[PDB]
Design a binder for this molecule. Structure first.
Ligand code: NA
Ligand code: NA
Ligand code: NA
Ligand code: NA
Ligand code: ZN
Ligand code: ZN
Lengths: 428, 428
């Protein structure tokens, strides 16, 4: 009565001994690509009806950091997809209040979302999948699920996923990640196609005018780009059920297999004074507003200090940002000194004998590289990797102040720290 | 009667399946670190009495490329040492001609050597070991060899390595890499310490005023920094015997072990009209003169097009540089075009449906990454990796000209090309 998970076979794959917190196993398990060194990755994107806020920044900066670690640090080949939910009841309601068209509202706030991501040095995905551009593919996706007998059509023209039929199959389990969270045959059945009121935006289908259900959007778009097995699927933890568990059920029903996703990664949400930052509560800080108070580096350090899959509390009025500003200042001043010493070093007059002080710094340098390696393997532990960099910088600053300078050693140290800061998404 | 070679054990090491051309085995063998992902690497540097020329550029740019592949691409931890031979008969003779002082002449041309390396975007090594700063350590190194009974002192105050005594030992073999190339007990004995000629610069020693022999300099300095096992030792192929084979004998004698170096890499020399570029022949082109006609990128492309361990012929008067200029121009124009397409892309008015043209380009993109990976694993095959990049750029240009653009895909491809060009040492 418990869902089973199959670890990908290691033969022929890139093996880093990376471990990740997999919501499918509720445990840290070794990460193994489905093919070679390739990672097919789908991450749920925003619903675009208003300005993005610091909670959205936490989600996509956290996954940006993970992506940079996977690509820049481990040298996996990441094929990444992020969707835009530009059809949704919230977009419809806001469009009528503002008296603008639904498409015009969604495109404006999708544009501002990407501008905010770029301002935070978040990389764009390989593919951007908008629901409004994939409705035809969604209809075909639903037709296959019906043909596989896992969805039924109501009299009013809606289509519902048939939970009971899906569970019956030995190969299928419903709600793999949150089993206990569980016209219609059963109440738990969810809509793949919702019959549209004539005043709502709608699309033609074999079953009548309607709109896609929320969950089928992501199953369709991820399946069309990345296929029948995703290495990684990600989102905020609140999407784990019903949204993501329903995605798994739909995609298994479409492909008639047992494991559409190998690793499901859920980031923790940003809370402010204990409650999730959300437009509903009126506790939100837009990313643009945040960037008039703090820099991209400082905001990224905020998220580097909080493990990606843990809940974090943000204390406003600068309280949480005090530490980020101090860390940012120490990185700026370290780079200032080391860059100048490299530039002004004179090979004509120096002595380059490899001293004991040189050897000690070099030993700490190589040791720090191994510590950071273990931290990244440990489920992307950026808080301890950042601390390791701080400790190394403290010793480099002492060395630059007092000791005779090995120019090449300082240059190599500078390149390594730049490599880690590129992996973090910091720009100095 | 054949030297034996021991491959390092794979347990606990970083294993990339990289193969390198090892002069100790005269074959391509898998590269396995002695410890973890670490690479201790010593490369023979210049003798500094005159301007550096294009032959030197080939050696140190080739090793710079290999180092960048090892560090930036494969993520090995490389600890690299390059020496400066600033005591040598050539420096002594040139100093009497120039009358500016022996130390001062050597320091002048060492300074210009490093300036030329920087002009070619060649990274400084972790440690720079000048012979003049290590004479005391050289004397102690020779003392240990004598104490181990592998060197004797002549009446005139020179010290010679005792080949016959060294060979007798079961654990030792003399001239491991070129076995057939082979006061003194035997003619083949070589000097560790040279009694000082009158009027020449000299240093104190237990055996009298003198200068180090050439080979003992590199054994001493490499051993002092990197210890009793080097992962890599490198130099131009003409150094393989007697210089490098003698280095192995001296270092084995000092540590009384059987394998001082695991992988000995020898770069091919640059020839011009069939003869090695050399100050003696008067066929040389200085790096400075080369840089008044061509750029760092163009010169680096010249060397990327020639496998590092093969001989290359250089046709002067621009003939060889015609192809390098064409390639460099196409890279500059590619970046101009793609940056313009990215900057002019408007997320507000676009359609981002993942088209057949998008999928075709992405498939070629991932395929190109695997081709380049296999080229680097195949003994640092930069000529075919560069060709793979050129082919990819040809298809990206076609895609940018006609197809509707997936902005995220173009950015990701640009970042990969930036990564490969950082690995090559090209700057655009
Ligand atoms: Na079942
Ligand atoms: Na939930
Ligand atoms: Na022997
Ligand atoms: Na030779
Ligand atoms: Zn989703
Ligand atoms: Zn040498």
């Amino acid at each position: 009565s418990l869902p089973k998970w199959n670890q990908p076979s290691k033969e022929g794959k890139k093996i880093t001994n990376l471990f990740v917190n997999n919501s499918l196993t509720h445990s840290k398990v070794e990460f193994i690509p489905q093919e070679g060194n390739k990672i097919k990755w789908y991450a749920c994107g925003p619903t675009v009806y208003d300005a993005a806020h610091l909670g959205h920044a936490r989600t996509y900066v956290s996954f940006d950091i993970i992506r940079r670690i996977l690509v820049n640090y481990f040298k996996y080949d990441v094929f990444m997809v992020i969707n835009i939910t530009d059809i949704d009841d919230k977009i419809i309601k806001r469009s009528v209040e503002e008296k603008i068209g639904f498409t015009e509202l969604a495109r404006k706030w999708e544009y501002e979302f990407w501008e905010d991501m770029k301002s935070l040095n978040v990389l764009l995905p390989t593919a951007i999948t908008r629901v409004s551009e994939y409705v035809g593919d969604i209809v075909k996706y639903i037709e296959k699920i019906i043909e596989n007998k896992y969805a039924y059509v109501s009299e009013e023209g809606s289509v519902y996923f048939d939970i009971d039929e899906f569970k019956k199959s030995e190969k299928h389990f419903y709600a793999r990640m949150e089993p206990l969270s569980v016209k219609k045959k059963n109440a738990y059945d969810f809509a793949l196609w919702k019959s549209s009121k004539p005043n709502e935006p709608h699309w033609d289908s074999p079953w009548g005018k309607g709109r896609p259900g929320w969950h089928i959007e992501c199953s369709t778009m991820a399946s069309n780009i990345l296929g029948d097995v995703l290495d990684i699927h990600s989102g905020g933890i609140d999407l784990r059920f019903p949204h993501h568990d329903n995605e798994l059920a739909q995609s298994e029903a479409f492909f008639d297999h047992s494991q559409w996703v190998n690793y499901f990664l859920h980031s923790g949400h940003l809370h402010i004074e204990g409650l999730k930052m959300s437009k509903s509560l009126k506790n939100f800080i837009t990313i643009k507003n945040m960037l008039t108070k703090y820099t991209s580096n400082q905001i990224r350090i905020l998220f580097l200090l909080n493990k990606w899959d843990n809940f974090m509390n943000y204390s406003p009025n600068g309280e949480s940002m005090v530490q980020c500003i101090e860390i940012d200042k120490s990185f700026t001043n370290f780079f200032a000194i080391i860059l100048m010493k490299i530039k002004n070093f004179d090979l004509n007059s120096c002595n380059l004998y490899w001293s004991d002080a040189d050897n000690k710094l070099n030993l700490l340098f190589r040791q720090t590289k191994n510590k950071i390696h273990e931290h990244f393997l440990d489920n992307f532990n950026t808080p301890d990797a950042l601390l390791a960099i701080q400790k190394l910088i403290t010793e480099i600053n002492i060395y630059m102040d007092k000791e005779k300078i090995q120019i090449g050693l300082l240059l190599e140290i500078k390149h390594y720290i730049n490599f880690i800061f590129d992996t973090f998404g910091l720009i100095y």
